[PDB]
Amino acid sequence: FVEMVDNLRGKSGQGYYVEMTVGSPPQTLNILVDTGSSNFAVGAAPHPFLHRYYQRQLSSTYRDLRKGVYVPYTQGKWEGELGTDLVSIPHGPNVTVRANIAAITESDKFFINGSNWEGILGLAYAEIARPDDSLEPFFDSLVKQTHVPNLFSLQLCGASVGGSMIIGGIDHSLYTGSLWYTPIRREWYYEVIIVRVEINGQDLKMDCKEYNYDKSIVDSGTTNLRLPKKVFEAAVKSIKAASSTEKFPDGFWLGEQLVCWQAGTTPWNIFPVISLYLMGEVTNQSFRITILPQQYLRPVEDVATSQDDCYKFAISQSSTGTVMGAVIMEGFYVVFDRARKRIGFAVSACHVHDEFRTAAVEGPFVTLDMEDCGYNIPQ
Ligand SMILES: C[C@@]1(c2cccc(NC(=O)c3ccc(Br)cn3)c2)COCC(N)=N1
């Protein structure tokens, strides 16, 4: 695994990517690591924001599947053609596999200027693959063709950013303390269950099904912690109360505006810690992961504003359920244990902390109320 350490790069707020090769002879591309989708999709035609792209005419091993694919997102969309080809991860496991590839021929608001990635590696399950669940995702092909163990782990390290994707195992050098596991509720997204939320120690006191309306997922391809409307409004109220010694524009709380302080003077202590309690592997047991403001107040690098440190509020409202994005994942080592249908969390070797508070993963906690917190009926 040591050879896989530090194999992720990126720019803050732009996405963590890993180097891959496609085709024969191999064409190198940087690929966004995305646990919230299930297609391997790469730019395959020129684009102003792309420095390079997949040139299929140069790959003898490309096979056309003679099928188009159209993928709209809330923001942005792309269109392309399906095929298969040989794929490798130079700083991953030492194998080459044949995998499905969506060649992106047209796109809108998909590629990001200066992000330095040219495609996306969807690491979730076939159920949410496009055009449908018959298109085998990359990691499924990897496991079937190489018998590398059916799990991977992600260590995303915040501020240029970096990290590690360990394919096929767990690297103990990347975390401290204990690994705590929460069950994968359903294999489509990496869906999990949140059973309690506290902000600076104070329970939001909602029916726990609200936390998972209509699902909660772990998503390396989303920046923010995204929360259902009801939970979001409660969270903002609590954070506002905690930080009330300073008043910020409403635009800040909507993520429409930055807040800035003179470089080095950010008042971290007036912002509360957020604790997310995740369902444990035993009935009505849970553990919590705790989030510092250094995680949910994201610095926006800009030379023009650099007399100051300026931040975006990286918690936002969702109508599609909770998303535990990078602001949650950064500073933790997150194990996607597909074989045992569970997600593990531990404190990352590259964790967030000032001299007063430290991000944590800890437990066990017990709850009397026997209610299932899943928004849908369990199976
Ligand atoms: C396919 C989809 C998608 C499409 C295009 C770009 C992205 N991600 C990013 O640009 C990005 C930026 C910063 C950080 Br930290 C993580 N990711 C994600 C749709 O949105 C949800 C999802 N998980 N994947």
Curated annotation (Swiss-Prot):
Q: Which GO molecular function entries does the Swiss-Prot or TrEMBL record give?
A: amyloid-beta binding; aspartic-type endopeptidase activity; beta-aspartyl-peptidase activity; endopeptidase activity; enzyme binding; peptidase activity; protein serine/threonine kinase binding
What is this protein's function? Answer: Responsible for the proteolytic processing of the amyloid precursor protein (APP). Cleaves at the N-terminus of the A-beta peptide sequence, between residues 671 and 672 of APP, leads to the generation and extracellular release of beta-cleaved soluble APP, and a corresponding cell-associated C-terminal fragment which is later released by gamma-secretase. Cleaves CHL1.
The Gene Ontology biological process terms listed for this entry are: amyloid fibril formation; amyloid precursor protein catabolic process; amyloid-beta formation; amyloid-beta metabolic process; cellular response to amyloid-beta; cellular response to copper ion; cellular response to manganese ion; detection of mechanical stimulus involved in sensory perception of pain
Describe the location of the Peptidase A1 domain by residue ranges.
Answer: 16-346
Keywords annotated in UniProt = Acetylation, Aspartyl protease, Cell membrane, Cell projection, Cytoplasmic vesicle, Disulfide bond, Endoplasmic reticulum, Endosome, Glycoprotein, Golgi apparatus, Hydrolase, Isopeptide bond, Lipoprotein, Lysosome, Membrane, Palmitate, Phosphoprotein, Protease, Signal, Transmembrane, Transmembrane helix, Ubl conjugation, Zymogen
- The residues on the Extracellular side of the membrane are 1-379
Oligomer and partners: Monomer. Interacts with RTN1; RTN2; RTN3 and RTN4; the interaction leads to inhibition of amyloid precursor protein processing. Interacts with SNX6. Interacts with PCSK9. Interacts with NAT8 and NAT8B. Interacts with BIN1. Interacts (via extracellular domain) with ADAM10 (via extracellular domain). Interacts with SORL1; this interaction may affect binding with APP and hence reduce APP cleavage. Interacts with NRDC AND NRG1.
Protein name as it appears in the record: Beta-secretase 1
Q: Which domain of life is it from?
A: Eukaryota
Please verify whether the record's keywords include Acetylation. yes
Cystine bridges: C157-C350, C208-C373, C260-C310
Bilayer topology reads:
Single-pass type I membrane protein
Tell me which species this is from: Homo sapiens
- The stretch of the full-length protein covered here is 60 to 449 of 501
Tell me the enzyme class. Answer: hydrolase
Q: Where in or outside the cell is it found? A: Cell membrane; Golgi apparatus, trans-Golgi network; Endoplasmic reticulum; Endosome
The record's EC number reads 3.4.23.46
Tissue specificity is:
Expressed at high levels in the brain and pancreas. In the brain, expression is highest in the substantia nigra, locus coruleus and medulla oblongata.
Query: Which residues does the entry assign to the active site, renumbered to this chain?
Result: D34, D219
**Glycosylation positions in this chain:** N94, N113, N284
Gene of origin? BACE1
